[PDB]
UniProtKB/Swiss-Prot annotation, chain B:
Subunit structure: Homomultimer. Interacts with host TRIM6; this interaction inhibits the IKBKE-dependent activation of the type I interferon signaling pathway. Interacts with host ANP32B; this interaction promotes M nuclear localization.
One GO MF term attached to the UniProt entry: structural constituent of virion
Subcellular location: Virion; Host cytoplasm; Host cell membrane; Host nucleus
Name of the encoding gene: M
One GO term (biological process): virion assembly
Known function: Plays a crucial role in virion assembly and budding. Forms a shell at the inner face of the plasma membrane. Transits through the host nucleus before gaining the functional ability to localize and bud from the plasma membrane. Mediates together with fusion protein the incorporation of the glycoprotein to the viral particles. Also participates in the inhibition of the host interferon type I antiviral response by interacting with and thereby inhibiting host TRIM6.
InterPro entries xrefs: Matrix_C, Matrix_N, Matrix_Paramyxo_C, Matrix_Paramyxo_N
GO cellular component: host cell cytoplasm; host cell nucleus; host cell plasma membrane; membrane; virion component
Protein's recorded name: Matrix protein
Motif Nuclear export signal 2: positions: 218-226
Keywords: Host cell membrane, Host cytoplasm, Host membrane, Host nucleus, Host-virus interaction, Membrane, Ubl conjugation, Viral matrix protein, Virion
Family of the protein in this entry: Belongs to the morbillivirus/respirovirus/rubulavirus M protein family.
Length: 299, 301
């Protein structure tokens, strides 16, 4: 467990609070913000969920990655002219369903999401889903469009994560602390394994990497790592031109949304946690409801 | 949106607080508790779900936190006091590490006898999502060896004819031109703090739901489970589908892991249950379990 220097997160370690703005005459004026931690763009908008004037709550509507040359003000204005419905319902978990909208022009790169209904896990796109009505029609009045520019870099979600188990190796784990306007949350993630080399030797290799950490708004909150120094011949062959790693933090740690919602978020500490790797023989139990017989749960 | 009567959850709608007990001289005495919703019939070989709770403490000495160690379903005829005593004689190590998410890794040692039906979990290392088995994983040390000192064994009996659900076994909820039967459940937590969640039961092609005479109770599968029993009547097609039986169970910490942060170290109780009848979500709607969507297919495979 060795701490990185604060300079490694100073430049981009801050994510601004999502907030509506007013014009000179007090009317809400939609806005956008671009994070670049420029044609591939991730879009996520925020709006008021209202009756069809009464404001029930705020909700996020992720649109995903699209390739576009349109100016962000044209993406924003077209988005605010759409009629987006909001429903609170359930599948396995409680859901927020956004209705279909159209026609599109500047937003055609995000048509897969916008032109048909979209079902989201309510916990990832809203803190207080219980405020959305079940007996009244609801609609989204968008006030902010968050944009994060991507480089077609390594972008991770739980299903694309690689195997972390290894038998004779040192795991390079990363412990990150977030200060929320103060409340402090922390999480750990596995970066890789240094296959067998002492823990101190591994630390010197990590110092030479000159890692930089920053935050983005992919999924509402993402962690971006950039290698500004040097890496091994084996890791260099695996990665090639890739120097950037990005993690969708609301998909890995959905519990973060309840904490960062409607608040500013910033990296306050980052530490390398070098531990023996978890052996391949150990069993992964993602679900606590385990069935050792064959009779209660299939495969 | 119609509320069920409180009588529908009175009998089994309560889950006791997990807490250690002391003897007449102040020393901790491990205990067990059996929950039998949806499995009240007595049989020699019982299907039993086991989850224990212990103090995570230093080895070479402070109590750092409490953690749950799920053992899963095993078929056994042993008395619960023999399962408990053998479990407390094992030397279980605890490690805080990471995969995709932060993990708590257990390691058991000591041969098994009454615990042989749970050997798959106990005889090799077990990697759990820290959020589902511990509220404050950041209290577990990274620079010291840690051990589990078990104080409670929670047991929930199962009936192999019943339906037991986890996210990967739950069925398709989308349908065109149907009415969804959704269920809104409220839990009162002593903390009182009230949490609520909704789940999809099925789709119809209120009076039919009243005739079902549903009963709701809580169990300790995964630390907290919801059990529904049909005491009235249903259609011939729905009885054939449910496997010719009237029990349905949901592992609530696997569906709604956020509940653990709220119910941890507290008693939990059903305070309200309502049917929420809505138009079904059409099949044309897209499911986005991950908020990081890639419409280009060039960023994510
Ligand atoms: C796109 C996927 C991610 C790309 C790499 C993103 C970075 C990353 O994950 O590094 C892993 C690497 C090796 O560790 P590790 O034991 O995890 O080795 C890899 C791992 O086993 C994968 O699961 C394998 O893929 P697959 O499932 O069998 O296919 C992969 O092989 P292949 O696939 O080649 O056959 C293995 O190489 O870690 C270091 O060198 C430690 C320093 C890390 C410093 C990082 C600082 C930022
Ligand atoms: C292991 C068993 C698990 C399932 C049983 C556990 C309970 C459960 O899941 O019920 C679902 C049932 C109907 O569900 P729903 O109509 O959405 O689902 C369809 C139904 O299952 C048909 O039988 C399937 O085949 P088919 O059309 O014949 O070909 C059809 O498949 P396919 O057309 O897509 O291929 C399914 O889409 O719900 C009610 O009746 C509402 C009252 C619920 C009352 C409360 C119950 C406690």
């Amino acid at each position: 467990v060795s701490d990185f220097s604060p300079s490694s997160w100073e430049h981009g370690g801050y994510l601004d609070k999502v907030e509506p703005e007013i014009d000179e005459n007090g009317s809400m004026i939609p806005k956008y913000k671009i994070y670049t931690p420029n044609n591939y763009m991730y879009l996520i908008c925020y709006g008021f969920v209202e009756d069809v004037k009464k404001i029930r709550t705020i909700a996020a509507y992720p649109l995903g990655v699209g390739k576009s040359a349109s100016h962000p003000q044209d993406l924003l204005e077209e988005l605010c002219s759409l009629k987006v419905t909001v429903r609170r319902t359930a599948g396995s978990t409680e859901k927020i369903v956004f209705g279909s909208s159209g026609p599109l022009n500047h937003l055609v790169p995000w048509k897969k999401v916008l032109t048909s209904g979209s079902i989201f896990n309510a916990v990832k796109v809203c803190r207080n889903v219980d405020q959305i009505q079940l007996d009244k029609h609801q609609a989204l009045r968008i006030f902010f469009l968050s944009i994060t520019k991507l480089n077609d870099g390594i972008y991770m979600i739980p299903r694309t994560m690689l195997e972390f188990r290894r038998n004779n190796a040192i795991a390079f784990n990363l412990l990150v602390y977030l200060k929320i306007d103060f409340k402090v949350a922390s999480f750990m993630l596995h970066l890789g394994n240094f296959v067998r080399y002492s823990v101190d030797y591994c630390r010197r290799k990590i110092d030479r990497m000159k890692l930089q950490f920053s935050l983005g708004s992919i999924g509402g909150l993402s962690l971006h790592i950039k290698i500004n120094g040097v890496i091994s011949k084996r890791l260099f062959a695996q990665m090639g031109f890739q120097k950037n790693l990005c993690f969708s933090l609301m998909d890995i740690n959905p519990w973060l949304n309840r904490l960062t919602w409607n608040n500013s978020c910033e990296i306050s500490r980052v530490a390398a946690v070098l531990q023996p790797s978890i052996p391949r023989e150990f069993m992964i139990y993602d679900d606590v409801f385990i069935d050792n017989t064959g009779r209660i749960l299939k495969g």
